[PDB]
């Protein structure tokens, strides 16, 4: 908006193009009753294909918000040049009510909390990787440093803070850092090196 008298109108071809593509992507992938149907090359192992098909559909849709994940990974990929998805083994646990279960959680990952090396092209050939995640201290206290919990990159916040304008990820939410369930950033890493 160079000048007030310059009539600072703006075109939104980018917005229209993304929505037009999305009107079809969800109409193809996330439009059917299920998402995928495993099929085997023989019958005597096809007793596992249907089981796997029902299992993932139960997980991806009947358990996880698959519609949100696919839609978020779509609208935030045509502009970010990539997007990422993470699956992980849940170990959540709680009159000695100590129920413990195991789940395969799937959550969308923005392309801003990701750090990859340069001479790599794919996940397999990659030698280093990083993934910045906000995690609660309760996960940390359960296995490490139970005696000290006063633990305390702008670009990693700016891009997500410029995915909108009423939200800022680095702002102070309000909860104190002493709280057992307070969130804190972590440094996830996947590197091939000589640990031995």
């Amino acid at each position: 908006p160079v000048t007030a008298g310059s009539s600072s109108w703006v075109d939104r071809t980018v917005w229209e193009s993304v929505n037009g593509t999305l009107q079809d992507i969800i109409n193809v992938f996330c439009s059917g009753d299920e998402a995928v149907t495993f099929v085997a090359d023989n019958q005597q192992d096809s007793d596992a294909a249907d089981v796997a098909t029902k299992l993932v559909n139960q997980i991806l849709l009947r358990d996880n918000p698959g519609y949100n994940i696919i839609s978020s990974a779509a609208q935030e990929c045509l502009v970010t040049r990539n997007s990422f998805i993470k699956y992980y083994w849940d170990e959540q646990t709680s009159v000695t009510y100590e129920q413990t279960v195991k789940r395969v959680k799937v959550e969308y990952v923005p392309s801003e909390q990701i750090f990859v090396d340069e001479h790599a092209t794919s996940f397999a050939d990659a030698q280093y990787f990083c993934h910045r995640v906000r995690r609660s201290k309760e996960d940390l206290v359960a296995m490490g440093f139970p005696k000290d919990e006063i633990e305390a990159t702008t670009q990693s916040t700016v891009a997500w803070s410029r995915t909108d304008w009423r939200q800022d990820i680095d702002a102070d939410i309000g909860t104190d850092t002493e709280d057992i369930a307070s969130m804190v950033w972590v440094y996830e890493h996947y590197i091939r090196t000589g640990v031995l």
């Binding site: 008298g5 310059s6 009539s7 600072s8 109108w9 703006v10 075109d11 939104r12 071809t13 980018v14 229209e16 193009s17 929505n19 037009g20 593509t21 009107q23 079809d24 992507i25 109409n27 193809v28 992938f29 439009s31 059917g32 009753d33 299920e34 998402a35 995928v36 149907t37 495993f38 099929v39 085997a40 090359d41 023989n42 192992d45 596992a48 294909a49 089981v51 796997a52 299992l55 993932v56 997980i59 998805i85 699956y87 083994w89 195991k102 395969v104």
Partner: protein, 249 residues
């Protein structure tokens, strides 16, 4: 990025020329000006001057014939490097699998629509197919998964490591919302084929017939064991009629 820049600037240039021309200027010196009288806002004026060659509409810059017109076709430039249209038909999973699925009039085979089939095909074989394969390997090496068996409608604790690998398992993506429908007719078509022969009739006996009708129904009507069909465990063979007994005797 380039398209938005040009279209913004061209429309911006369009707007100010319009805003200048629409609310017009006029020209006359103090001589024959009549400042008091001219300020009347009534379109039906009652007073003028007698020069008859004094005031004319200001020579506003005209709208250029080519400057805005030849960038009016910048729309199809987006249509070339992208695949979105404000009036074109969308895509579907069925035509995604086979473009000739609607070969009647919905030929589907246009640059506008087969280009959008790029990313969905690319995102499928770069994305989800690795997602299922990753999950399928992942679910294969941890935990104990219980699976509901449909013979008694019970529950069985199946070892996940007894599951096979991706080597003998193939995955597909983007199933049709009505993939239940065509499977039902396929089973019916196959059912009438085998029923047409008799050498398979002993092989296609009575226990097979029930759950086939169930699956055909299960795609639309699930709960058949209570109102639609009788369970196999209670289909006791009918005692022969006394008429047949006396005919035998």
């Amino acid at each position: 990025k380039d398209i938005q820049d040009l279209r913004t600037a061209l429309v911006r240039g369009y707007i100010d020329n319009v805003n200048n021309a629409n609310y017009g200027r006029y020209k006359a010196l103090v001589g024959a000006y009549d400042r008091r009288s001219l300020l009347d806002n009534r379109p039906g004026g009652v007073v003028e001057m007698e020069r008859q060659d004094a005031i004319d509409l200001f020579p506003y810059h005209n709208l250029p014939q080519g400057i805005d017109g030849l960038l009016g076709m910048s729309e199809e430039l987006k249509e070339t490097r992208t695949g979105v249209t404000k009036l074109g038909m969308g895509i579907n999973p069925d035509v995604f699998k086979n473009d000739n699925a609607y070969a009647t009039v919905g030929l589907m085979m246009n640059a506008a629509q087969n280009r959008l089939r790029m990313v969905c095909r690319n995102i499928a074989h770069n994305g989800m197919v690795e997602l299922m394969r990753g999950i399928y390997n992942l679910i294969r090496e941890n935990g104990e998964v219980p699976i509901e068996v449909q013979t008694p409608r019970g529950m069985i604790q199946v070892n996940p490591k007894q599951l096979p690998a991706r080597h003998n398992l193939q995955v597909v993506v983007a199933i049709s919302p009505n993939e239940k429908a065509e499977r039902a007719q396929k089973l019916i078509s196959l059912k009438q084929l085998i029923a047409a022969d008799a050498q398979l009739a002993p092989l296609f006996g009575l226990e097979q017939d029930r759950y086939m009708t169930a699956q055909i129904f299960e795609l639309m009507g699930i709960k058949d064991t209570h109102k639609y069909l009788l369970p196999l465990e209670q289909y006791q063979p009918p005692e022969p009629s006394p008429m047949e007994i006396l005919q035998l005797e």
